[PDB]
Amino acid sequence: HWGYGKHNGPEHWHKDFPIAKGERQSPVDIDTHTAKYDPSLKPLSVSYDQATSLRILNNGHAFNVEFDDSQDKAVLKGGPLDGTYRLIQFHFHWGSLDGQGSEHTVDKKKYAAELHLVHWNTKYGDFGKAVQQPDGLAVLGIFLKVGSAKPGLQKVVDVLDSIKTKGKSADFTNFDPRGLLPESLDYWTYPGSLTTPPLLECVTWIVLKEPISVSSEQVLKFRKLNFNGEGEPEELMVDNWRPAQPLKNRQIKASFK
Ligand SMILES: NS(=O)(=O)c1cc(C(=O)O)c(NCc2ccco2)cc1Cl
Ligand SMILES: [Hg+2]
Ligand code: NA
Ligand SMILES: [Zn+2]
């Protein structure tokens, strides 16, 4: 099965998922001097007041915090997007040490981690239909650097003990994802893909310029999770990031001057 190790990591994924070598793969390096300001881009509208989180799951590659997406509650609109995109889950990618872990890079800089808030385009009715469309998904990406603690992350950190191994889940209601956002909503945007198999080319990426700070203790707890299931040899869940992929014939646009 695919993973992040020597024998099943990103360099192998193309064998089962040939789109890994496709024309709009993610992540990418954001070259800040080539990304052009686009005055036609709109402010991002993040409407999370009515979010209903349900559960947190260790899926064997990361952990997902899942939301009720059965009705318009937490939605992303504006920015580069046409229409309304509903929040379905968020997860992170992170490193074994603070100097790596992000998927996107900024002028080749790797952050300690990267948060992905995954949303699907409601014009397609359900997530499964949305991932058959080139504008089916919008992912809001937020970099994490190590410094001061992020208070809004601590509830996540504190439940991880209970989902140590693949396939474990726990109730995770009443979590407010607004507490994971930075001050500024300035962003870069480009067309891309899932960064995990099946690597589907459905995503409008919206990557915030401003990182959030989290404490060393917070990210250290991420690194105590396990890729393996209960009763199997312990493989720490670290370095669950895909490296930057070729930009090809794409443009990265900046929302800010
Ligand atoms: N890392 S990511 O944000 O590109 C991402 C990552 C994952 C993930 O499973 O880690 C994911 N799972 C849902 C799924 C299944 C088929 C299409 O989307 C979706 C996305 Cl967009
Ligand atoms: Hg997995
Ligand atoms: Na450009
Ligand atoms: Zn992701």
From Swiss-Prot:
Annotated phenotype, changing residue 196 to H: Higher affinity for bicarbonate. Enhanced proton transfer capacity
Record-annotated site: Fine-tunes the proton-transfer properties of H-64: 4, 59, 64
Site, Involved in the binding of some activators, including histamine and L-histidine: residue positions: 89
GO molecular function: arylesterase activity; carbonate dehydratase activity; cyanamide hydratase activity; zinc ion binding
Record note on what altering residue 62 to S does: 2-fold decrease in enzyme efficiency, as determined by kcat/KM ratio, and efficiently inhibited by chlorzolamide
Required co-factors: Zn(2+); Co(2+)
One Pfam family this sequence matches: Carb_anhydrase
EC number: 4.2.1.1, 4.2.1.69
Impact when changing residue 116 to E: Strongly reduced activity
Residue positions, PTM Phosphoserine: 162, 169
Outcome when changing residue 194 to E/H/R: Strongly reduced CO(2) hydrase activity
UniProt-listed GO biological process terms: angiotensin-activated signaling pathway; carbon dioxide transport; morphogenesis of an epithelium; neuron cellular homeostasis; positive regulation of cellular pH reduction; positive regulation of dipeptide transmembrane transport; positive regulation of synaptic transmission, GABAergic; regulation of chloride transport
Domain Alpha-carbonic anhydrase: 1-256
pH dependence, entry free text: Optimum pH is 6-8.
Reaction catalysis annotation: hydrogencarbonate + H(+) = CO2 + H2O; urea = cyanamide + H2O
Binding residue positions for Zn(2+): 91, 93, 116
Effect of residue 4 to F: Enhanced activity
CDD domains per the UniProt record, alphabetical: alpha_CA_I_II_III_XIII
SUPFAM superfamilies per record: Carbonic anhydrase (SSF51069)
Effect recorded for residue 103 to A/Q: Strongly reduced CO(2) hydrase activity
Effect the entry attributes to changing residue 198 to A: Normal CO(2) hydrase activity, but impaired stability
Note from the entry: Target of drugs used in treatments against glaucoma disorder and breast cancer.
Protein purpose: Catalyzes the reversible hydration of carbon dioxide. Can also hydrate cyanamide to urea. Stimulates the chloride-bicarbonate exchange activity of SLC26A6. Essential for bone resorption and osteoclast differentiation. Involved in the regulation of fluid secretion into the anterior chamber of the eye. Contributes to intracellular pH regulation in the duodenal upper villous epithelium during proton-coupled peptide absorption.
PANTHER family according to UniProt: CARBONIC ANHYDRASE, CARBONIC ANHYDRASE 2
Pathological association: Osteopetrosis, autosomal recessive 3: A rare genetic disease characterized by abnormally dense bone, due to defective resorption of immature bone. Osteopetrosis occurs in two forms: a severe autosomal recessive form occurring in utero, infancy, or childhood, and a benign autosomal dominant form occurring in adolescence or adulthood. Recessive osteopetrosis commonly manifests in early infancy with macrocephaly, feeding difficulties, evolving blindness and deafness, bone marrow failure, severe anemia, and hepatosplenomegaly.
Protein name from the UniProt record: Carbonic anhydrase 2
Natural source organism: Homo sapiens (Human)
Lineage: Eukaryota, Metazoa, Chordata, Craniata, Vertebrata
Gene name per UniProt: CA2
